Amino acid sequence: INSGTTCSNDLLYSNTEVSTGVCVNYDLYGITGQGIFKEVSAAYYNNWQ
Amino acid sequence: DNETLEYWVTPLSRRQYLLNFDEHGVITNAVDCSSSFLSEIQCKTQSFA
Numbered sequence: 672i673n674s675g676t677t678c679s680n681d682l683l684y685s686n687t688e689v690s691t692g693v694c695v696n697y698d699l700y701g702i703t704g705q706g707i708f709k710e711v712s713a714a715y716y717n718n719w720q
Numbered sequence: 721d722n723e724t725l726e727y728w729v730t731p732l733s734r735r736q737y738l739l740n741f742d743e744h745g746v747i748t749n750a751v752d753c754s755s756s757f758l759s760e761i762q763c764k765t766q767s768f769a
């Protein structure tokens with residue numbers, strides 16, 4: 672629950688931009704919460720992570 | 721040419737390990753928590769040293 676790509680479209684919203692530096696509510700592919708984003712240069716993600 | 725076939729098999733069970741992840745996210749070390757006394761100390765401190 673709250674993670675994956677089997678999604679229910681009963682409440683449909685449009686995709687927004689990932690805005691950085693401000694406190695936001697987020698719903699990232701099921702993951703929900705509140706926080707501040709910061710764009711980074713990461714090299715530790717494989718093709719399945 | 722002095723080649724050999726090898727296929728080593730051991731059984732699996734559900735058990736607790738302590739894993740060490742490095743800077744790149746690679747598993748480098750593991751300890752089975754119920755195998756020895758030092759492994760019990762390592763799993764109760766959550767430290768490899």
Ligand SMILES: *[C@@H]1O[C@H](CO)[C@@H](O)[C@H](O)[C@H]1NC(C)=O
Binds near residue numbers: 694
């Ligand atoms: C605080 O407010 C300023 C606008 O005055 C904004 O640029 C900044 O991102 C805000 N800080 C946070 C953490 O939201």
Ligand SMILES: *[C@@H]1O[C@H](CO)[C@@H](O)[C@H](O)[C@H]1NC(C)=O
Binds near residue numbers: 721
């Ligand atoms: C294979 O092992 C035998 C041992 O009697 C040796 O004489 C032979 O040279 C070896 N061949 C190779 C390719 O290593």
